[PDB]
C-alpha cells in the first residue's frame with residue numbers, strides 16, 4: 001500500500017485561447033460531450049456506458065480499441081480498476097460532421113501506486129442521435145506510466 | 155505503403171473534406187509537410203505562434219518553431235499524411251489523421267495515429283499541437299527521441 005500522493009493541479013497553458021467560448025458548448029452534441037466528461041470523475045462504468053450506442057467504439061490510441069457497447073464497458077471497467085479520474089479539464093471543444101473535439105487535461109490517480117498525474121489529451125467524439133458511436137483519446141502512454149509507476153501496455 | 159481507412163472513420167463523405175477557409179489552409183499545410191522543408195512550412199505561421207508534438211517540449215515563437223521543425227527533419231521525413239476527420243470552432247481546427255513517417259538513420263517506416271489542433275489568426279497558424287504516442291514510433295523504426 002502507498003498513500004495518495006499530492007495531486008498537482010492544472011496548469012492553464014500559454015496556448016489556451018482566452019476566448020472563453022472556445023471551451024464552451026455550442027451544439028447539443030457538444031453539450032452532451034461536456035456532460036460526459038463531467039461524468040468521468042465519477043469513475044463509474046455503469047454511469048458512463050449509458051452515453052453510448054450499441055454500435056459504438058472506444059480507444060485510448062496507445063491501447064487496443066473496444067468495438068461494441070459490450071466491449072467498451074469491459075475496457076472502461078478494466079481501466080477503473082487501476083486508475084481513477086480526479087478531474088477533467090477541457091480547454092477547447094468543437095464540432096463538425098458528427099465529430100466533437102476536446103482538448104483536455106485529465107487528472108488521474110494510479111490506484112496501486114497512489115501516484116497522481118495530469119495528462120494532456122486531445123479526444124474526438126462521434127455522436128448519432130445524442131449517442132456516442134465512437135470515442136478516441138490521443139496522448140503519450142509512456143510518460144503517464146512512468147509518472148505513476150503503472151505499466152499499462154501489454 | 156498506403157493507408158487503410160479504419161472501421162471507425164466517419165463515412166460522412168464530407169467529414170474529411172475542408173469545410174471553411176481555415177480548414178483549407180491546414181489541409182494545404184500538410185501537403186507541404188511531405189516537402190520536409192522547415193523553411194517552407196514556417197510560411198504558414200504567424201510570429202506569435204507555438205508548436206508542440208506533445209510528447210516533446212513546446213516550441214514558442216516562430217524561429218523556435220522553424221528550428222524545431224528543421225531539427226526534426228534531420229532525423230526523419232514524412233512520406234504521406236492522410237486526414238480522416240477535419241472540423242473547427244472558435245478559430246481552432248482539429249484533424250484526425252495518419253502520418254506515414256520514415257526514420258533517416260534506420261530507413262524503417264511507421265504509420266502514426268495523430269490528432270492535432272491548430273489555432274489560426276488571419277490565415278496564419280498561431281498554435282499547432284499534435285497528440286500521439288511517442289514510444290510505439292521509436293520502437294517501430296528504432297529511433298529514440300525521448301531518452
Ligand SMILES: O[C@H]1CCCC[C@@H]1O
Nearest residue numbers: 060106119121137139
Ligand atoms: O485520458 C486518458 C488517460 C489514461 C487512460 C484513460 C484516459 O481517458
Ligand SMILES: O[C@H]1CCCC[C@@H]1O
Nearest residue numbers: 207253255266268284
Ligand atoms: O506527426 C508527428 C509524428 C512524429 C513526430 C513529429 C510529427 O509531426
Ligand SMILES: [Cl-]
Nearest residue numbers: 056057161162
Ligand atoms: Cl464503428
Ligand SMILES: [K+]
Nearest residue numbers: 015202203204
Ligand atoms: K502563443
Ligand SMILES: [K+]
Nearest residue numbers: 021022024093
Ligand atoms: K466551443
Ligand SMILES: [K+]
Nearest residue numbers: 095096242243
Ligand atoms: K463547426
Ligand SMILES: [K+]
Nearest residue numbers: 168169171240
Ligand atoms: K469536414
Ligand code: NI
Nearest residue numbers: 001002112113
Ligand atoms: Ni509495491
Ligand code: NI
Nearest residue numbers: 001002003114
Ligand atoms: Ni509510499
Ligand code: NI
Nearest residue numbers: 003004005006
Ligand atoms: Ni506526496
